[PDB]
Structure formats: structure tokens, C-alpha cells
């Protein structure tokens, strides 16, 4: 009953010793000679209006033109960013949706929330109307985030401490991940799609193998709950956001925190994070009603996107990097470029 | 100027906007309430009486009330509670009979009232199980002083309005509990949101009327704030 606890403590100490032994140089010191990016200025190119309630999540399509937004008023709206037009308006059975996803092929959209069900909507029906293809049930907690692997496989994270891989044509959890301690909030698919990393409220981030199904790597550098996570474009690193007003960069091949992005004047929480196309700039949403752009190499703030009067909940960058969308609880989505 | 496809897309967007405005108007005439409390509080009985995530719909004075009982999540309420940042009011049910379980109820009320995401949301407090509390007080077995070392130095305020027929001890205990809850409520908030204590006997049919009145008052205060009148 107690020997295993001592063994676990010894293993953790050994892991810490291994991590510190291979920490000869720090990322900030190496990037000292790199010239600063400067002061990036972004303007609200497009403003999207129509949602009757606070926005909780959004996701860009692979075409970098169509994006899907989820609001607590029960409407899932697909927007045309270039022309500011609403392609579809999907009614939701549950108005407590808190996540949404856009399929890579653009044929399907998924969303869910406190209903503990991830509902997949078909956007290319025969007669033309958007209809539910299948709704995925089995989670014992609110749906926190979901991301499509393809038209048939979608990875799911729920407040029940577990993440699952689903087969849309079948509706059963192909693989279940149960390594977290509580309330896994967000997950990010790697560019290769063979791995994904999720953040939870236990101030830890765990790397998962989609096919093997077991946890390969864990990260513990935060002090509060983690609610934002995004994969670095290279795929060998990721950034996480928490309520400590700090964003931290973790590398899979190093098992260590490269740097911490924080400032004294920032004490509010962090809601969403996302990298640019090249990963040079890290954009993180905050509860101070504004988003600030960080430098992934020198950990220096570059600009502030102050265009929302309410909490910023979601933020996403287009695949081509042309523009970044920011969502807020004021029921407005703004496109920055 | 524009093409046929562009015109069709614009017309579809206009139709979607019209439908969204219609849906928003339909939802505007409905009040959303969050129901939460301990297991022994008695939420199920109250909602069953009102109607005679789990959703209960009841209409008072031709006004739709939509009450939500999450009652489908782990014991941690840290995150999903944020989804109700824009509810009309929060209905909190406390079993005043259980003195052992009262301290945890007070702690829960403190957490709810002081939440950063619930600062602008008023709370409707129902002290359920009043007959059980009254019989427990008129028993001589369990003393509130044992659990709370302040009931001894407490007297019933002259502003109390007891029902016709009641012993001084029962009303004194009820108003001591109300004083504790009101002191917790007024410890923070700066008057932005108000607590509406009430007595529920687990059989009263006036709970819906009291909720209706509390919602009317909350909406009045919100409109006064919007118009800069208060």
C-alpha cells in the first residue's frame, strides 16, 4: 500500500534528474542573438454578427475561407469570412454547446457540450438540408473539445477525465484514454495525425498515441488548470494555456518546458492559444477582454488585439496563415490580419 | 456588380439572419434558471410540484420559465458552471433540518456567490424542509448551538413576520439561518446581485409564484442598470 508510493516517487525523481541532466542550454539564451520580430499590428478585417449568445468555440476549415462557430443560444453557424455571409445555420438540440469542429474535407461538422454527446452534422445531404449523420454517446461528462481525424474518425475529450477515439460509421469508442486526473479541457492533433496532446485541470499535459492508445509522454509545469493547447507546426512541440496568466512551451523530444510567456501586469486566465503558420508568433486568448501576441523564440509581447469588450473564449489561425479569428462572449467574431 | 451565385448567397444570408432574429425573439420571452443544491436539498420534489441535463418547464402569468438541473456531471463544478454566466437567476435549495450538512451548504453558497463568472447573477434561496426543521427544534435532542457557537447569543429581530401560530424557538432558528445566509450574501457583491431568501415546506404550491416575483424584481433591477436609473 505504501511501497508503490515510494516507487512512484523514486521514478518521478529519476525522470526529473534525467530532464535536468539534458538541460545544458536554455531556449531564451540560444535565441538571445535572434532579432526581435518588432510590433505586429493587426486590424479587424471582418466582423461577424448574428449570434444571440456568448461564443464558446470556433474552428477554421481546411480551405481557410469557411469557419464554424458555436454559441450557447443553440445555433451552429458556418460563416463565409471573405464575404461575411452565413452559409448554414444548424439548430442544436442542446443549447449548452461548448465546442465545435470542422472536418478536414469540409463534409461534416461536430459539436457538443453539457449534453455529453458529440453530434456530427452532414453538410452535403442529398435534398440539401443539413442533417445529423450520427451522435456519439458514451462520455459521462460534458464535452470539452473534439477534432476530426478524417470523415470517419474523430478524437474526443470530455470532462469525465477521459479522451476517446470514435468511429463515426459505428458510433463506439475505438480507443479510450484514461491517464488524466480530471477534467481534460482541450486537445490538439499533430500535423502527422499519429499523435495528439491534451491539457487537463490537473496542471499537466499528456501526449497520446492514437493507434497504440497508451500515454507516451507527460508534462507537468503549470500551476493551475490547463484549458488551451495547440501543436507547434513542426509537430515536435506544443504550447499550453492555464489560469496562471502564463503560456508555456513544451517539446516532445525534450520532456521539458522551453520557456514561459508571462507578464507582471497580466493576472487573468488564458482561454485559447494558437501558433502562426511558421510558429514564430504565439497568439493566446485572455480573460481581460483582449488577446496579446507573443514571440515563441524570445518570449516578448509583440502586439495586443483589443477588439472585444467581453471574455475571449476561442481563437484560431487559418491553415495558410492569412488571418486569425478571435471569438468572445459578446457574441461577435472578429477576423484579424 | 454581382453574379447570380453571389446574389443567391446574399439572399440565403438574409433569410438566415431573419430566422436567427425570430429565434432570438422567441428565446427573449423565456427566462432561464439554474437549479443546484445538495442531494438532500429536495430539488426534485420542488420541480415536480412546480410542473404538476434535466429540464423542467412551467408557465406563470403566461411567462415561460426554463429551469435546468445539470445533475449529470462529476463532483467538480469548476468549469461547466461557466456555461450559465447569462441565466436569469440561480435557485439554491438548502435543507435547513440537517445541521451537520448546513455548513457545507453555506460553503457552497459562498463559492457560488463569490464566483467571478456569477457576480451579476442573482440567487433565489429556498430553505426547504421547514416542517422537519420545526419538529426538530421542538424536540430537545439536537441543539443548533452545538454546531454553531453563536445561536446562544442571538435574538429574533422585531422585523420578523412569523406565520399565524408558531413557537418562538422555530422562528428564532429559521431567522438565525436566514441571518447566516444573508451575511454570507452581503459580504461581497456591492449590490450588483441580490439574494432572495424564502421558506419552503416541501409541499407549498407558491414556489412558482415566488420565483416569478423574484425574476420580475431581478429584471427590474437589470433594466434600471441598463437605463442608468440605479
Amino acid at each position, epitope marked *: 500500500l505504501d511501497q508503490l508510493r515510494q516507487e512512484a516517487e523514486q521514478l518521478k525523481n529519476q525522470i526529473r534528474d534525467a530532464r535536468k541532466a539534458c538541460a545544458d542550454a536554455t531556449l531564451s539564451q540560444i535565441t538571445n542573438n535572434i532579432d526581435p520580430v518588432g510590433r505586429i499590428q493587426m486590424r479587424t478585417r471582418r466582423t461577424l454578427r448574428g449570434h444571440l449568445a456568448k461564443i464558446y468555440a470556433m474552428h477554421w476549415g481546411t480551405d481557410s475561407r469557411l469557419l464554424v462557430s458555436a454559441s450557447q443560444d443553440g445555433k451552429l453557424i458556418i460563416w463565409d469570412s471573405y464575404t461575411t455571409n452565413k452559409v448554414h445555420a444548424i439548430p442544436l438540440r442542446s443549447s449548452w454547446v461548448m465546442t465545435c469542429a470542422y472536418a478536414p474535407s469540409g463534409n461534416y461538422v461536430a459539436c457538443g457540450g453539457l449534453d455529453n454527446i458529440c453530434s456530427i452534422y452532414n453538410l452535403k445531404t442529398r435534398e440539401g438540408n443539413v442533417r445529423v449523420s450520427r451522435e456519439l454517446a458514451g462520455h459521462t461528462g460534458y464535452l470539452s473539445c473534439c477534432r476530426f481525424l478524417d470523415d470517419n474518425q474523430i478524437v474526443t475529450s470530455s470532462g469525465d477525465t477521459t479522451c476517446a477515439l470514435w468511429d463515426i460509421e459505428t458510433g463506439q469508442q475505438t480507443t479510450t484514454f484514461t491517464g488524466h486526473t480530471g477534467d481534460v479541457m482541450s486537445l490538439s492533433l499533430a500535423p502527422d495525425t499519429r499523435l495528439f496532446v491534451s491539457g487537463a485541470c490537473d496542471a499537466s499535459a499528456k501526449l497520446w498515441d492514437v493507434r497504440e492508445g497508451m500515454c507516451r509522454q507527460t508534462f507537468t509545469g503549470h*500551476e493551475s488548470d490547463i484549458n488551451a493547447i495547440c501543436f507547434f507546426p513542426n509537430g515536435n512541440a506544443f504550447a499550453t494555456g492555464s489560469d496562471d496568466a502564463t503560456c508555456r512551451l513544451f517539446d516532445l523530444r525534450a520532456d521539458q518546458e522551453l520557456m514561459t510567456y508571462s507578464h507582471d501586469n497580466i493576472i487573468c486566465g488564458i482561454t485559447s492559444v494558437s501558433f502562426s503558420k511558421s510558429g514564430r508568433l504565439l497568439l493566446a486568448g485572455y480573460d481581460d477582454f483582449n488577446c496579446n501576441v507573443w514571440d515563441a523564440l524570445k518570449a516578448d509581447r509583440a502586439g495586443v488585439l483589443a477588439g472585444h469588450d467581453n471574455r475571449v473564449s476561442c481563437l484560431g489561425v487559418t491553415d495558410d496563415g492569412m488571418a486569425v479569428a478571435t471569438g468572445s462572449w459578446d457574441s461577435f467574431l472578429k477576423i484579424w490580419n | 456588380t454581382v453574379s447570380a451565385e453571389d446574389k443567391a448567397a446574399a439572399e440565403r444570408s438574409k433569410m438566415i439572419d431573419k430566422n436567427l432574429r425570430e429565434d432570438g425573439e422567441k428565446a427573449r420571452r423565456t427566462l432561464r434558471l439554474l437549479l443546484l443544491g445538495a442531494d438532500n436539498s429536495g430539488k426534485s420534489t420542488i420541480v415536480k410540484q412546480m410542473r404538476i441535463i434535466f429540464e423542467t418547464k412551467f408557465q406563470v402569468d403566461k411567462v415561460n420559465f426554463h429551469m435546468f438541473d445539470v445533475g449529470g456531471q462529476r463532483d467538480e463544478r469548476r468549469k461547466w458552471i461557466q456555461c450559465f454566466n447569462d441565466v436569469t437567476a440561480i435557485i439554491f435549495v438548502v435543507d435547513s433540518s440537517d445541521y451537520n450538512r448546513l455548513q457545507e451548504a453555506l460553503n457552497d453558497f459562498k463559492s457560488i456567490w463569490n*464566483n467571478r463568472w456569477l457576480r451579476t447573477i442573482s440567487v433565489i434561496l429556498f430553505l426547504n424542509k421547514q416542517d422537519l426543521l420545526a419538529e426538530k427544534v421542538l424536540a430537545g435532542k439536537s441543539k443548533i448551538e452545538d454546531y454553531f457557537p453563536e445561536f446562544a447569543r442571538y435574538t429574533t429581530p422585531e422585523d420578523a413576520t412569523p406565520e399565524p401560530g408558531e413557537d418562538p424557538r422555530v422562528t428564532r432558528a429559521k431567522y438565525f439561518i436566514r441571518k447566516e445566509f444573508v451575511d454570507i450574501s452581503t459580504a461581497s457583491g456591492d449590490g450588483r446581485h441580490i439574494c432572495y431568501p424564502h421558506f419552503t415546506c416541501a409541499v407549498d404550491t407558491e414556489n412558482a409564484r415566488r420565483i416569478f416575483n423574484d425574476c420580475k424584481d431581478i429584471i427590474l433591477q437589470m433594466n434600471l442598470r441598463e437605463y442608468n436609473l440605479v
Partner: nanobody
Amino acid sequence: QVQLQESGGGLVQPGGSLRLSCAASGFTFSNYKMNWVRQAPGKGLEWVSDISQSGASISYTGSVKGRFTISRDNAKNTLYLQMNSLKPEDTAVYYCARCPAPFTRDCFDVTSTTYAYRGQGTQVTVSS
């Protein structure tokens, strides 16, 4: 990693006094509100006392109000809880709990079955 360790406890005669301390690491102790959680055998978690960020606000539960003295030490990142005049019913496990977020007067996860920001706890037994 955020971890909490509780030092002290043991077997104490009724009416005696014992002093236990909680060790905090991996987070800014000053910026995080600290709480004490007790779990009597056969009963769920209950709240005992809490400590403000600067210690200005001090509160105790009704059961042990006026009996336990609690102090804070931000310099050493440790929490002190002085207990005297104990009773047999006080025999339980004291868990060192931390508020989920810093600079917040509200803490919902203080009493949770599977809370992550709590220590292993120490068993205290009061008997003759």
C-alpha cells in the same frame, strides 16, 4: 509539478494539543489561497479553515471555531495549523488543499472527492 505534503499528526490523548505543517512547492504560495480539508472516517470531505493571500481574512468552521489557530508563512512556502483541546470526534485525516486559481476569493474544488490540488494527508487519532 504542484504537490502538497503534510507533516505531523499521530496519536494524541483527548484534550491535548498537536501542531502540524503543510509543505507547498511548484507554485507561488503567496498568490494562492490555502484551505484545510478534513475527512472523518465514514464521512465525506468537510471544510475546516481557509487562509487569505495576505492572511487578512481568517475564517473557521463552526465545529472547531475558537479552538484551532492557523498561521501562514509565505517566506517558507509552508502552512501551519495549531490544534489544541482536541476531542475524540476530531479523529480524521487532514488534507492540505489549495484553491484552483490564484487571486480568486472563490474556490469550488475545496471539497471534492478527486481533487488534484491536495496532498496525501495525515491521520490524527484522538483516544484515551
